[PDB]
Ligand binder design. Structure first.
Ligand SMILES: COC(=O)C[C@@H]1N=C(c2ccc(Cl)cc2)c2c(sc(C(=O)NCCCCCCCCNC(=O)COc3cccc4c3C(=O)N([C@H]3CCC(=O)NC3=O)C4=O)c2C)-n2c(C)nnc21
Ligand SMILES: [Zn+2]
Lengths: 375, 803, 127
């Protein structure tokens, strides 16, 4: 637990990628249901969520050429959500728009470091590997299914003037009783329609997130249910199949419902290789980054890890000596952490370099190594 | 691929709006009533109302206002539909032929815009200079009322006030001026804006913005000589006319929120006000300038959806929750202290929350028992075909579910009543109802922090055993505290010859968003007393229960469970199925099970008796609000979804690919125009081109019937529909395909797999030349069989004989 | 699973000196390559057991890594710059021999060799 004085804005900056990159302010969004021909990055194996910051380091000449071509055009590439990545099977995905880039000379080879952000979900229609070896994807933009209020079709016109509204539990009781009154016209009561109300689910998830982060919901958390749902999904430490099932969801209400069901059910995080070795619990999860408790970071050899920060973790051995080289969190030294039983890499133990920092130590576990578990 | 036929058996009885004016003649006083898709025109006589016209439109009437511009001899009628079809109509009668001609029409929907929370608002400027529409937030649509605007062209003006609650056109203004109540982070205020047609913009209003009540909801434009505007909230009634600011806070209106009004005197001296609890108050304006405001409780009527003053103290009260009324007001109060005397009552079946089919009287002749109304307007309705004879049994509390038990010759009905918190420690009912005036009553045994509050309403749920002959409330069993009953079934289980009443419940608490505790209670009714035979505790809400081949199929949140009835008269779990969704809707046919979610998440399972579990057959996830589901046959499933639509999904048993065998193909879409609440298998005609019979009850009291057809008959009736649409003049000139098209704000597709039975039945009313036009130049035998007018008359008569 | 002992770095019988070339190779070249972000695979002998590469020391007959070169420079194991340059070249050549063109480690070794050659062209004259 304890208190924090680290400054949560530093991990989001990805300062380990060197000096200040060239930043882009323009935004390119394609119309819904429209088809686009987007290039696919060959070495990206992550299941990207819209709004999630993705850092990359590319040194292959083909990758650097493709990145230059994208920077010269719309700065958008396709990140395939692979169901079976060994055979490179992909049915869904998410676009990523490059918002920062930096090519570095005085270097052994031409290398480019990139910060992009997920934008639009999509369904993969066609995959064609070009003669260059790089592959293109003919892609259909998936639309955000926004459904109206469940009372809109069963609303009394005389009560239309009562639908605008000016101890939180009493406030929510009054909200439920006033917004879903006309539920007495249907076969279902008010408290059932509350289970499908965007704001009620958003407030329950806000409570569950207040359990994790001390940043107030006044500013950090978005108000739109779609953006809120994507922000929550970007920081949920779940396996790849559950994340794929969550990306397939098009309606924000279903997304929030599934997210709160996950937050209620899965309470332990075990080793994926062990399945029977508890590593941490939901209670030790804490947010050290503005993007939440879990964020995507890139390492010196090009691998992207979704790191979830926790205060404590058990059943882990520490390999090697601590190092500050290319550390994802400035001011902390990492130490490789393996499972006590199967020796699989679970994450790193980050220890503060200065004695005045808090927390003095924490754990960053990679999402690909964890498995959620219900007791 | 679906081939279905849907037809209306009872037109909507709920009243959503009523106006008075001079529409048929300048000397006649006309009363116009809107019943969703129906428009009724009456002439106000000394005795009462003389019916002069009834028409049907291809839309849901959202705005209905009369207005008389300069030069017109009598009033015109402006009508806007739910699909944003606006029109201006005029009454025309020559001898006996009455025709509602269309003076103007057009679609006012914008390509971009979010529909407002307060819904559609339609106002007309007093001097008939323009029509104002409030459809989307931040935009005000203006339709200039010139003589050349037959297409009803309109332009939008930007609104800095994004959350407008109510708006009215003020009287006595040189320029058309609107006065509206809006809300901002500072609170609720009232503002005014002049509408410039030359600039097509807004100009500063006559008086500055005033800070009003936090619950200011209603705006009333006072006519001359008073002028100004009255703002009505939950606690205060204010009046603003430039320098004139008059606020009153009568406590008699603090009990309930006033939701409707109507002008009595043409100069605006007296007004009628109706609250949510059915109370009718009189607002008096004392006088060049306004002297004072006064509120007098006139009495109690039905829960008023709309009020209108006719003449000679006669007032029409249009109600959707209950029967409509014609009431008489008197100068002197009676013996109980109420100036209101009920003259006449008009049946209203809305809302229909549940229903069932019973052969009460003559065997073979079916009757329909429905749970209608809500609160003190709750009742049971017994409907049979003679057009339709309806018997009413008032309950004075809200009915929710119903089922029939033949062996005991009685009905089981789930009901709920509202009670206020007691001053000491408990709850007190607001009025005597069926649950409190039963010949016998009982309560449940057993198996809450921050208790009670200050006079806050609480729902008390009861099971009512009602005799099928006399309809006396034989028994009224009350459930536990904080217990909500959801499902009800009457059936025999296992080898037990007794027929039981099974009720599924849920424990609801304010701290729990989702119920984690519930009951399945098994009662037996015999010798005029209800006893609890069995009781099972489940870890969730029992949303639905179904008799499944001598077993009990229950839906406990996300789980579908099968119970067996033991010899010790206990419920034994046989098998479970854990789903990705919460099992809201449960239906069965043989060994097939249909599971449904509020967001159109459909699942089809099959019971494997040799293995003793459930096996997934198919599913379909398309997010859209639902309301009711039913199984048409082994392969077809009917449902009602968002925006008053019906749909039919189909499976392929044999099929070709196991990946395709697990998908339910959407084979039918239709725009009904009603919000269906209940589907049930049954028919009302004495026991053919049609196969099956599924009745459905809706919110506006409309009752419908759906049946299945063959491919040849479906194609023939589709061609007939196209021809009839080509020949029939629509009121407001609304396209039939546009009205029947599956309409949501996300998508709009043409209707498929459905035959509009009302359109086909309208073929018998047109003239013989129109019949020959339709049958002009028209595949069961394998080739091409010709068709004359008499053949189609016989076909349509045979199709009408099914309802 | 031989994984032999690392190459020797100290020899008391071996004479030592601080040539200008070797002090440049240590203070500039090795310090530049050691802090590079692609240096880590070469900072220690190849652990053929943990990497599951039983054929590595059957193909690579002259193992070499930057940790060995660092310890040899710090212990003054070399007599002249040619030995250290040959050790670097042996490391790079071993990396290219065992792996395949286009592999990630091959590109990393190519980058390091390019930077090494660009630093070695400024080798100072002996004092
Ligand atoms: C299949 O194999 C073959 O084909 C033959 C074979 N191949 C290879 C080879 C290489 C690269 C790739 Cl790609 C693939 C293959 C290979 C070798 S020898 C070799 C090796 O020596 N290994 C074991 C030694 C371990 C390193 C010693 C410690 C150095 C200190 N380390 C750093 O300081 C750098 O930092 C790193 C490094 C890695 C990962 C991370 C970081 C780091 O900081 N972080 C995070 C922490 C949190 C944060 O906040 N930020 C971050 O960035 C990381 O996650 C290898 C691997 N080899 C050779 C030579 N010839 N042939 C082959
Ligand atoms: Zn493990």
């Amino acid at each position: 637990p304890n208190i924090i004085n680290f400054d949560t804005s530093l991990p989001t900056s990805h300062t380990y990628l060197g000096a200040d990159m060239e930043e882009f302010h323009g935004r390119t969004l394609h119309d819904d249901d429209s088809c686009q021909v987007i290039p696919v990055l060959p070495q990206v194996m992550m299941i990207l969520i819209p709004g999630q910051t993705l850092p990359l380091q590319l040194f292959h000449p083909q990758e650097v050429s493709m990145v230059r071509n994208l920077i010269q055009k719309d700065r958008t590439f396709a990140v395939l959500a692979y169901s079976n990545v060994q055979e490179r099977e992909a049915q869904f995905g998410t676009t990523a728009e490059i918002y920062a880039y930096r090519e570095e000379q005085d270097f052994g080879i031409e290398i480019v470091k990139v910060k992009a952000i997920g934008r639009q979900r999509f369904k993969v229609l066609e995959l064609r590997t070009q003669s260059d070896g790089i592959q293109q994807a003919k892609v259909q933009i998936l639309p955000e299914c926004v459904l109206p209020s469940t009372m809109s079709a069963v609303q009394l016109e005389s009560l239309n003037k009562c639908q605008i509204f000016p101890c939180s539990y009493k406030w929510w009781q009054k909200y439920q009783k006033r917004k879903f009154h006309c539920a007495n016209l249907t076969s279902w009561p008010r408290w059932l329609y509350s289970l499908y109300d965007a704001e009620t689910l958003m407030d329950r998830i806000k409570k569950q997130l207040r359990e994790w982060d001390e940043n107030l919901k006044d500013d950090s958390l978005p108000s739109n249910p779609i953006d809120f749902s994507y922000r929550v999904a970007a920081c949920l430490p779940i396996d790849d199949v559950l994340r794929i099932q969550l990306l397939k969801i098009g309606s924000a209400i279903q997304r929030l419902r599934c997210e709160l069901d996950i937050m209620n059910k899965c309470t332990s995080l075990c080793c994926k290789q062990c399945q029977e070795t508890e590593i941490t619990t939901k209670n030790e999860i804490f947010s050290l980054s503005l993007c939440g408790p879990m964020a995507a970071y890139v390492n010196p050899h090009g691998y992207v890890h979704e790191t979830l920060t926790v205060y404590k973790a058990c059943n882990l051995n520490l390999i090697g000596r601590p190092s500050t080289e290319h550390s994802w969190f400035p001011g902390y030294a990492w130490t490789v952490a393996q499972c006590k039983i199967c020796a699989s890499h679970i994450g790193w133990k980050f220890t503060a370099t200065k004695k005045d920092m808090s927390p003095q130590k924490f754990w960053g576990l990679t999402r690909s190594a964890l498995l959620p578990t219900i007791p | 691929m679906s081939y279905n036929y849907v037809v209306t058996a009872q037109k909507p009885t709920a009243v959503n709006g009523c106006v008075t004016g001079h529409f048929t003649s300048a000397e006649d006083l006309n009363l116009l009533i809107a019943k969703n898709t129906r428009l009724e025109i009456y002439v106000v006589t000394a005795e009462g109302l003389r019916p002069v016209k009834e028409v049907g439109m291809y839309g849901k009437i959202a705005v209905m206002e009369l207005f008389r511009p300069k030069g017109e001899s009598k009033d015109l009628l402006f009508i806007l539909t739910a699909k944003y079809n606006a029109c201006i109509l005029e009454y025309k009668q020559s001898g006996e032929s009455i025709d509602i001609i269309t003076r103007a029409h057009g679609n006012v929907q914008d390509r971009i815009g979010r529909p407002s929370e307060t819904g559609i608002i339609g106002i007309i400027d007093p001097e008939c200079r323009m029509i104002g529409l409030r459809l989307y937030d931040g935009l005000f649509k203006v339709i200039p009322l010139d003589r050349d605007n037959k297409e009803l062209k309109a332009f939008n003006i930007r609104l800095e006030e994004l959350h407008v609650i109510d708006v009215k056109f003020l009287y006595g203004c040189q320029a058309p001026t609107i006065c509206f109540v809006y809300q901002d982070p500072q609170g609720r205020h009232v503002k005014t804006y002049e509408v410039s047609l030359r600039e097509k913009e807004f100009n500063k209003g006559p008086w500055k913005q005033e800070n009003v009540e936090a619950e200011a909801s209603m705006v009333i434009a006072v006519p001359e000589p008073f002028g100004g505007a009255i703002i009505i909230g939950q606690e205060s009634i204010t009046y603003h006319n430039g320098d004139k600011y008059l606020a009153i806070a009568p406590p008699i209106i603090k009990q309930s929120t006033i939701v409707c009004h109507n002008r009595v005197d043409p100069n605006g001296s007296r007004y009628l006000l109706g609250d949510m609890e059915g109370r009718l108050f009189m607002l008096l304006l004392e006088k060049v300038t306004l002297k004072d405001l006064r509120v007098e409780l006139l009495g109690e009527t039905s829960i008023a959806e709309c009020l209108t003053y006719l003449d000679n103290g006669v007032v029409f009260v249009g109600s959707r929750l209950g029967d409509s009324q014609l009431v008489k007001l008197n100068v002197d109060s009676n013996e109980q202290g109420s100036y209101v005397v009920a003259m006449e009552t008009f049946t209203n079946l809305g809302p229909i929350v549940d229903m069932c089919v019973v052969d009460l009287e003559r065997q073979g002749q079916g009757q329909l028992v429905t749970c209608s109304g809500a609160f003190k307007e709750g009742s049971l309705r017994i409907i049979r075909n003679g057009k339709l004879h309806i018997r009413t049994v008032p309950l004075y509390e809200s009915p929710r579910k119903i089922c029939y038990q033949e062996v005991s010759q009685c009905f089981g009905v789930l009901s709920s009543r509202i009670e206020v918190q007691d001053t000491s420690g408990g709850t007190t009912a607001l009025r005597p109802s069926a649950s409190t005036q039963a010949l016998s009553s009982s309560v449940s045994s057993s198996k809450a922090p921050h208790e009670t509050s200050f006079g806050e309403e609480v729902e008390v749920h009861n099971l009512l055993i009602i005799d099928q002959h006399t309809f006396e409330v034989l028994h009224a069993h009350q459930f536990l505290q904080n217990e909500y009953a959801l499902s009800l079934v009457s059936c025999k289980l296992g080898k037990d010859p007794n027929t039981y009443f099974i009720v599924g419940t849920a424990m609801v608490y304010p701290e729990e968003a989702e119920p984690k505790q519930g009951r399945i209670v098994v009662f037996q009714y015999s010798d005029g007393k209800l006893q609890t035979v069995a009781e099972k505790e489940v870890k969730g809400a029992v949303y639905s229960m179904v008799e499944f081949n001598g077993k009990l199929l229950a839906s406990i949140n996300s789980t579908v469970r099968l119970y067996e009835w033991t010899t010790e008269k206990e419920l034994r779990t046989e098998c479970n199925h854990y789903n990705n969704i919460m099992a809201l809707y449960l239906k069965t046919k043989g060994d097939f099970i249909l599971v449904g979610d509020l967001m159109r998440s459909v699942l089809l399972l099959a019971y494997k008796p040799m293995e003793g579990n459930f096996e997934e057959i198919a599913r379909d996830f398309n997010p859209n609000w639902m309301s009711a589901v039913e199984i048409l046959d082994d392969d077809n499933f009917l449902g009602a979804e968002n925006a008053f639509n019906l749909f039919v999904c189909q499976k392929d048993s044999a099929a070709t690919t196991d990946e395709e065998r697990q998908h339910l193909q959407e084979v039918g879409l239709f725009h009904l125009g009603e919000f269906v609440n209940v589907f049930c298998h049954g028919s009302l005609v004495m026991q053919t081109p049609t196969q099956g019979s599924v009745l459905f009850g809706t919110v506006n009291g409309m009752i419908g019937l759906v049946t299945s057809l063959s491919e040849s008959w479906y194609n023939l009736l589709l061609d007939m529909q196209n021809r009839l649409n080509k020949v029939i003049k629509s009121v407001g000139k609304i396209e039939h395909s546009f009205w029947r098209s599956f309409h949501t704000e996300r998508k709009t597709e043409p209707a498929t797999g459905f035959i509009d039975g009302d359109l086909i039945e309208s073929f018998l009313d047109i003239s013989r030349p129109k019949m020959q036009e339709v049958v002009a130049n028209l595949d069961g035998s394998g080739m091409k069989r010709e068709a004359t007018a008499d053949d189609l008359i016989k076909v349509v008569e045979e199709l009408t004989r099914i309802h | 699973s031989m994984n032999p002992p690392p190459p020797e770095t100290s020899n008391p019988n071996k004479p030592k000196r601080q040539t200008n070339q070797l002090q440049y190779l240590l203070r500039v070249v090795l310090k530049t390559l050691w802090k590079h972000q692609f240096a880590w695979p070469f900072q220690q002998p190849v652990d053929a057991v943990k990497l599951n590469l039983p054929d590595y020391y059957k193909i690579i007959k002259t193992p070499m890594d930057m940790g060995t070169i660092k310890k040899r420079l710090e212990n003054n194991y070399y007599w002249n710059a040619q030995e250290c340059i040959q050790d670097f070249n042996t490391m790079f050549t071993n990396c290219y021999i065992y792996n395949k063109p286009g592999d990630d480690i091959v590109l990393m070794a190519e980058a390091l060799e390019k930077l090494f050659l660009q630093k070695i062209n400024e080798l100072p004259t002996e004092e």
